[PDB]
Amino acid sequence: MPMQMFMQVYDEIQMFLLEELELKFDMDPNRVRYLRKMMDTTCLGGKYNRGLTVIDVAESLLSLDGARRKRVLHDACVCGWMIEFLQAHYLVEDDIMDNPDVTVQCAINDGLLLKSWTHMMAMHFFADRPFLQDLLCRFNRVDYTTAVGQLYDVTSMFDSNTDFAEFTLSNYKRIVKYKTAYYTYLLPLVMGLIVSEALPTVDMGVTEELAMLMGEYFQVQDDVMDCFTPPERLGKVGTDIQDAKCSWLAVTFLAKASSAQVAEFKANYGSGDSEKVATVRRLYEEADLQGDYVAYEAAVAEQVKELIEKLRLCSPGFAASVETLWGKTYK
Amino acid sequence: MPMQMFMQVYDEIQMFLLEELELKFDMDPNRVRYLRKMMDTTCLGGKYNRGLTVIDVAESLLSLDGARRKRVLHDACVCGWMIEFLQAHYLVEDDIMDNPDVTVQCAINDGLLLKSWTHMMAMHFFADRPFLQDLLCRFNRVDYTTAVGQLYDVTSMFDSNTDFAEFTLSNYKRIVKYKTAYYTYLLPLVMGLIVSEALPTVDMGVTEELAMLMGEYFQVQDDVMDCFTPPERLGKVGTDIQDAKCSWLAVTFLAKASSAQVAEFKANYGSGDSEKVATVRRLYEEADLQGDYVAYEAAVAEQVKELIEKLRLCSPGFAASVETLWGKTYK
Numbered sequence A, B: 001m002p003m004q005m006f007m008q009v010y011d012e013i014q015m016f017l018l019e020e021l022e023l024k025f026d027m028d029p030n031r032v033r034y035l036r037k038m039m040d041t042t043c044l045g046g047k048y049n050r051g052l053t054v055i056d057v058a059e060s061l062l063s064l065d066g067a068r069r070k071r072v073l074h075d076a077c078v079c080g081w082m083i084e085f086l087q088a089h090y091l092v093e094d095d096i097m098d099n100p101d102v103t104v105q106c107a108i109n110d111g112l113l114l115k116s117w118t119h120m121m122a123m124h125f126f127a128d129r130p131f132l133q134d135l136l137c138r139f140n141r142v143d144y145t146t147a148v149g150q151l152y153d154v155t156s157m158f159d160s161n162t163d164f165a166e167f168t169l170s171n172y173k174r175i176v177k178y179k180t181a182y183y184t185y186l187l188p189l190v191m192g193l194i195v196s197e198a199l200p201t202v203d204m205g206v207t208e209e210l211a212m213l214m215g216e217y218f219q220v221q222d223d224v225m226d227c228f229t230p231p232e233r234l235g236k237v238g239t240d241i242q243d244a245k246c247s248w249l250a251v252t253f254l255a256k257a258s259s260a261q262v263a264e265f266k267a268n269y270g271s272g273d274s275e276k277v278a279t280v281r282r283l284y285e286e287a288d289l290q291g292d293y294v295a296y297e298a299a300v301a302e303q304v305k306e307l308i309e310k311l312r313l314c315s316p317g318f319a320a321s322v323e324t325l326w327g328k329t330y331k
């Protein structure tokens, strides 16, 4: 029922958006079909973890009358597609960042449309909901937060706009929090609470802390996999070393390497050269970073498991949905 | 007083946005100063016609108590900077469209921040205004409209996503309406009405029609200047011919050229080659398009002058501000 409902609502949102373009925006069929294909290409195919989290949160909060239920679950699905479309928008923007060219014009246009669609679907489906303004404001603030996170990320290896000054655990956590944790972990949880009209019934502090911790757990595992998981298993080519990213491996290595090992890391980091990437990997391996990875994740897991209990004392149904979100990350 | 007030409010908005980043978003001074410079580079230096239109509309509607006045004029300035920042965002996106590259990453990031800033400044300055929701919805709808206009523009010379099928006056007007007229002419006028709480006191039909007509007048003159005004006088290098744009010159020429002249236009349009661009210019000159330009603009001017009178019958103060907006275009 969750996935089936989520896909049924996608068809509903898509038909609304496309009929609106045809009826109110003067769009010709060739362009409508082009946008149907583009929307399917960019919004479908993933795991829908962000979107499905909204549904899971709402169902927990209404179970713990069928007129309110049907409405809350539909609202949860629209909110879920708002986050999936926001994610689709970020992926398009990232694809331009890693590239009279009409393909680049179309990618920029696609990025703008996908973001505009999050507002169009909200303004329509939640038109007479009293939560519309708060939902829009929290969504916009989270989107802004992500752009700020991207600035921190993209400029991590620079400043005074090659320096390893910002290669610290505190800065790594700043990047993860802003760039990923707010829209991936916090926003789905918050949206599920908004639609359920149960936003003031939860300790936001513990929830924000949980979102940041789960985001941190996810990114550390993501960083390790980028470097060590082979492309056929990973589903992409890992480029963090070449890109000179402020990764968990890089910041952890710099705190435990010797002066000559740091000098060796500095001379080989941020290069496309196969042997320099391999030298970096050798340094991570020899510094027993994969042993430290196990313990770091376990300590984060202990903190997550503890905070869910504090949340469960005042918000039991919500804590079980935060538990399922965690199980999807801990997997 | 208008420009002085507008610039004073810019300093206020800038300091709010930058202090918010420093205090609430964990931003380091080097990045705050970088964003201050980027905001100044992208948002300042223009004529502020869109932003100043908001101020001019508000002042007409409150003159025709100092507590309501001071508030309405400040609100007009924030709305004006929302449109100027929206314009700054479109220009950045256009600059990416005409281009581990950190400069491209930063331009994409700049585009996202400038748009997010329109929401951040609205959510703060209008936090307890009853018009906040309507303002956000009308602004978002206009932004979406512009992205749709960009799709029509960028794909005008294509379809089934080189065809001159879409090189028609009706399609030219569709591009102008969506791509330019809604955010340049309609939005400043609408925002000035919103802040003045005088939105239901005007015939929206005549206003929308005026915005579309002024946008059309502006674009026809802009298209002609792109082709015939030399770069030192124009302030840019005119590239419409090379880019194979659906310009007023191209659509007007195709309706009055002979089969062999159309064949000559088709073989030379959309090329960077100096002699092919010159052949296109020769065709426009020989088809007496600059004679037709004079009459087309005069007919549009007659329609504009007439509709302002209809508007003046029920909304006199507003009509004088629509007259000043028109004088800035007719110049």
Ligand SMILES: O=C(O)Cc1c(Cl)sc2ccc(Cl)cc12
Binding pocket: A047, A048, A049, A050, A053, A184, A185, A188, A325, A328, A329
């Ligand atoms: O869905 C993604 O993009 C990344 C992703 C995983 Cl991989 S596991 C997981 C668990 C929860 C959430 Cl919200 C996201 C994710």
Ligand SMILES: O=C(O)Cc1c(Cl)sc2ccc(Cl)cc12
Binding pocket: B047, B048, B049, B050, B053, B184, B185, B188, B325, B328, B329
């Ligand atoms: O300001 C611009 O970008 C273009 C522009 C002119 Cl050039 S004259 C004029 C008159 C009114 C408005 Cl709203 C815009 C313009």
